[PDB]
């Protein structure tokens, strides 16, 4: 795999499906690239392979370690995955308040899933109003092509708007924000 294709597959959540479609012929290459070169895309892929035990044996601790290393280097999907693992209690002990920072960082980097999940957590009182602004900002200038996700984003935006004054809302809609 090239790095760019692996990154794009990671963002679409089809890296595991692709590796299965290859009948797991590149497993040795993935292991070598992740463990030795420390390529964040390959680190995330190897961590997901170890964690959920596809082809390779199921080693939850080591898989989470390599996912955390991909996050260390800063792969937004890795941060989002760790955040949703903490928020939903998948392979880890459920701690939404611990999930919040990971999701916040992934959202700040540009991960739409992280943005939606963070807004949902905040609307359940699992954070502080001192986030709403940023979260609202991140939900404001976000472009999606899925009508279902678009409706969900609009609903979350209105839910956040019902909780901040006009001063803060004005400041949020009037800031430089990208990704």
């Amino acid at each position: 795999y090239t790095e760019a294709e692996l990154i794009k597959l990671i963002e679409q959540n089809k890296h595991l499906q692709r590796v299965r479609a290859d009948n797991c012929q590149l497993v040795e290459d993935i292991v070598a690239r992740a463990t030795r070169i420390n390529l964040p895309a390959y680190e995330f892929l190897y961590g997901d392979m170890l964690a959920w035990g596809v082809c390779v044996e199921q080693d939850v601790e080591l898989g989470l370690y390599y996912i955390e290393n991909a996050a260390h280097q800063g792969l937004p999907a890795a941060l989002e995955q760790i955040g949703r693992y903490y928020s939903r209690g998948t392979l880890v002990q459920q701690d939404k308040e611990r999930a919040i920072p990971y999701l916040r960082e992934a959202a700040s980097m540009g991960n739409l899933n992280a943005r939606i999940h963070l807004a949902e957590l905040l609307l359940r009182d699992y954070g502080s109003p001192l986030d709403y602004e940023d979260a609202y900002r991140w939900l404001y200038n976000s472009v999606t092509a899925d009508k279902r996700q678009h409706k969900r984003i609009t609903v979350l935006r209105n839910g956040l708007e019902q909780r901040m004054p006009q001063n803060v809302i004005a400041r949020a809609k009037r800031r430089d924000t990208f990704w």
Partner: protein, 271 residues
Amino acid sequence: MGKRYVATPQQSQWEMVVNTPLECQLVHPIPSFGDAVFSSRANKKINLDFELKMRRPMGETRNVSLISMPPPWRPGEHADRITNLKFFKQFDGYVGGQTAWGILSELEKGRYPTFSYQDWQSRDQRIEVALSSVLFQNKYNAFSDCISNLLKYSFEDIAFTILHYERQGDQLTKASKKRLSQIADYIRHNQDIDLVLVATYTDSTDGKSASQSLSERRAESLRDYFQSLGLPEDRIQVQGYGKRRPIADNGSPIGKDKNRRVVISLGRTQV
């Protein structure tokens, strides 16, 4: 007997914190509670913010009642209900529009603007926060003097400017000089701008080389002027185009007047 936060006549004080042609700020410290801040800024339109800043932030979003209560030393006077606001969790209380001017007006009449609400930090009991009108009139006069001296334009109004040059010499027209002076005032008082694009053009009178040289000359003169205004060199990006890229018909003197122009674009990122 509930909780009532008000400054006693010996404790009340009003201060002008920010007094500049870009912002006016009047602060009333409410003892044991926080501050009440009136902020006005340079803009094309009338604007006033009232912010009730609390030492202990708001615990829950609550409905707040704004009333014009008479002080104790005014027997025989009834209280006027002003409005109902909503104070939000962990955000400073905000009043804006005509209601903030109404608070200032009720203070100018010797009355106490009182916000009543249920405090989360207080076992959800009703508390009052009043602004004292003692020693207010002098500072209200200073605040209104500051408001009268505010620039009548904001950054959005000077962001993109097309200036014109005279037919003879390298000097800007009267209107162009006036607009440059406005830009100079705002920049002098703000200096936050992070992109200053100065693209100069000329008419079709001179040759390509002479027009390019003249355009670059005037561009660098403007760049030196903007540096003298205090902006760093890195933010300024000047570019001369000479006779190239006309916008009007060079066959008429009106077209040549339109073509001897300079485009100054100012960009900043709030984040």
